[model samples]
Target: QQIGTIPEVHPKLPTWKCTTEGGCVQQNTSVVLEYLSHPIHEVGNSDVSCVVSGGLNQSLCPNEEECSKNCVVEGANYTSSGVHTDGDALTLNQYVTNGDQVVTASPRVYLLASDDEDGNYSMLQLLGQELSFDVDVSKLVCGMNGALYLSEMDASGGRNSLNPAGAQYGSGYCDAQCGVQPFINGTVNTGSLGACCNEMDIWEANALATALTPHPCSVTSIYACSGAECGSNGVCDKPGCGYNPYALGDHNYYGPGKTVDTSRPFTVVTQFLTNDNTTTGTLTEIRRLYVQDGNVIGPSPSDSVSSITDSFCSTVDSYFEPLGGLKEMGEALGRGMVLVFSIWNDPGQFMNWLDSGNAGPCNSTEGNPATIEAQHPDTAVTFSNIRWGDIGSTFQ
Candidate 1:
């Protein structure tokens, strides 16, 4: 009956401790899944899942009735004004997978998921082992960058996070920009043309690939790190365009290859061996895997960041190395993190990786904006069998 009688925090429920309080202190602590294939558990609207996170400030958004994610759109009434959300942006759908019924949702379809971290999610709670989800983008529209990522939010107030200098404890921002952007219907990181924020890219897959160039003369820094975008007057030049490294111009990009494709379904999973912090190593390692048609694909030995080591290469390093590097990167992700999804067109930044010089996949901004409005309005992604906690659970 001890441990607050909390199911997630039972002391006997070994692996990772659910709470951070030390020395048997009585207080609410973080918790994770005990078994494999443990569902994150989506639920009905009438319950706690339906309640808007208290982070948005009740005075501003009293409840879902006043501010619902369902209200956002490119040309809709709320899209032009102020209307934010701190919850699921995709609609819950019933999908029949191989004669089995499944429920799913997407950030892009009628509109896009929020490109900001002003929202909060409980899934961020730590896991004893691993986290995984099955997602499928039946189709991708033109010139848009769709993303599946993770972010941390303080229970104190979600959108209240204004830490841009990377100096916050217990919670912090990501490689991209994170803060409010004007003209945006709701709150979003508008930095780096909207590439990053208290988040890390989960699907930089073929479905999402890039080829980037760090700023010239500067040697190392990229702009989206703060969403500067023509503001720093740093470049407005080619590779050194707007935003920070997390945004368009300066960053790392990987070709999707055969493992990444549209119309087909795949499972994206990450196995994290993290300390209580990602900024400093307490035994932290991240391995990413893509499973499709029962085939498993992962980063090459040289490309993958496996095991606890000083040098983990490829994509993640290129962008975060300069800032306390891997140790610090882990610090950012070391704590509780929740699943997030969103999509956006090539806003105003100069994403060189999208250019032909890189032989990259997407165009900077030439595709028809009409495709999203006229050609494929119903385009959406479906995620299912979302489960986490401990590896090998999937095999069971």
Candidate 2:
């Protein structure tokens, strides 16, 4: 389907680009909430759904090409989608109260390079650099995921003659998981393919647990994966080389009263060290650090490692090496990746892999989406003071 003309306003979320010579300078950036390709209405009649229960309504969208000409994907309402921004801060609510009913608005937003209507997505070239941000996951719990990650999405959001409302409307989202969707790169997914791309999970955390992962894909940039390519032996590495304190053995390192202190806000700093120590160099190390109340905290003693390297991936994640491991991931980072911020809870596993058993200190049942929405509808996560620059420049 083509892009709709309905006007939508993006919430301004300023960020900084720091340097040791200069200081952190604010950049003109913003965030646009995205929506799955669901039919708004029929072109002939506004009352009828463009897509039926089974598939696209044959009457409205006769064919794939006509579907693009017939239907229009409109802009999303940021506020109703539980997105709120204050200067450099962004708060995403898990649920929002609309009239007499509560709606689950698991917002997924992308960072725009500019506020222009036809601008591109902000491509964060973070290889051999550092990214630091202050986050308050106090209200977040076991079931929730306050994620800030990077994906090798098109800088233009796949803008073309067929799809004109590209980055402005938050189009073209893909990741290492390569999940199949209704549309791929602003086009109809007639073949039922999965969108695959390199993914660097800078942070996926809650009050109970946190993880840093790097998911490298065999292919570079964005790719449309077929059935075999989307399988366990897919081109993208779904089980990434991750560093989770709890999963590694330190169950008490990130929770409420722990060292990082989840009860209050804290700064998270991730450094992408390269072999040659240059932006164009090969990525060699991924390090993590924390700053709270004038103190800098390194990785937990249990894990015995504060960074992820070739040896680290070889030891922990067997799946990552086959996909070319950190070397492939570093190339993608050097090429540039789009920044994504989201808040969601899994339904299939109830986020068991992130916050239960070896992952953290939560029971599997507590993460059920139904239970979370009914019990803690006010759950939210706030991220502020985002900055990326030369290693050690973003943090203290």
Candidate 3:
């Protein structure tokens, strides 16, 4: 939400608000800003100061079991009818929690649609070509984390869209696409999930399949991973039995001010430029980007930025030629990449990479999620004033 020209932190996103309808929200950019403001409390276990205001309501929470304590108020999870929260701000309690349980390790996100059910939207305007959001990870524990990013799913993307619910968002649950993830972490920063990882990093997760293969094409699995595990799976580095997790990306290839300041709230900005063919002015390629405190990082947020997802296999296999990779990667964003916010602990690659000098600042032995959340009951990450579209138009 922008205050005249100033961007104020809040929950939810622009032009949307939670409705009286159970778990529903409507678009309304004219909503007042104060309704979104939730003052911070002096959370006992929070290592960072609580001087900041207009954050999420998670601060008033008692503990993990009581986390997201401030999420609901007056019998309504959201109250746009009155001077309360809106799409710019949302309660984190239930979203952080799993079902009705108070436990908080596995990540859950309050997903907002940038596009519709059929993956169609008028346009994700790029007059400014930038997206901005504020994040507070000051209390993030050693083993846990929080992330904000842009993601897209296949045509058959709804829950249980695939038969047996195994191939898509079904009982087995497998549906989600590539993302330009700018996330915050604690102890497992070094490489708990992948090579390019740290306390704060700009990462990418590619799952879109190329023309070279239909779906689930892997070297080891009985069926191609796309169909076997499901379509639109992880970007396969070693796409076979027990395919390794490749979530985080390196910062040296990122933008400036890339590192996050855990002691305070900071802004993360990313940009996307369509590298179209000059002769025809037709889009030839797209360049994804990253910015910290408003400056582009060098070495480059390129190279692989626009590279098609699921293309990693083409460089490996001796038997097959190569994957054409997903061509819709860039255009998808223009249509609208649904914004997803979440937190979870990775037991895959990053946790084991602890303190190897490669991983950022992890000297402690394995940590416990329950222990941390219980101890710093106020430990939480808040994202507010999320605006994506034309850059300068953020304040408009």
Give per-model TM-scores. 0.47, 0.95, 0.45
The best candidate by TM-score is: 2
> What TM-score, to 2 decimals, does candidate 2 have?
0.95
Q: Compute the lDDT for candidate 2.
A: 0.85
Give the count of colliding residue pairs in each prediction.
26, 0, 26
The global Cα lDDT (0 to 1) of model 3 is 0.30
| lDDT for each residue of candidate 3 in 117-161, tens digit (9 for 90 to 100) | 222111233211555555555555554445454333222222221
Question: Which of the two, 1 or 2, has more lDDT?
Answer: 2
- For model 2, which pairs clash? none
Better of 1 and 3 by TM-score: 1
Worst 10 residues of 3 by lDDT: 182-191
Please say which candidate is ahead in lDDT: 2 or 3: 2
Tens-place lDDT per residue, model 1, 184-242, is 11233222232133344454322344222111111112223333543222222222211
Worst 10 residues of 2 by lDDT: 35-44
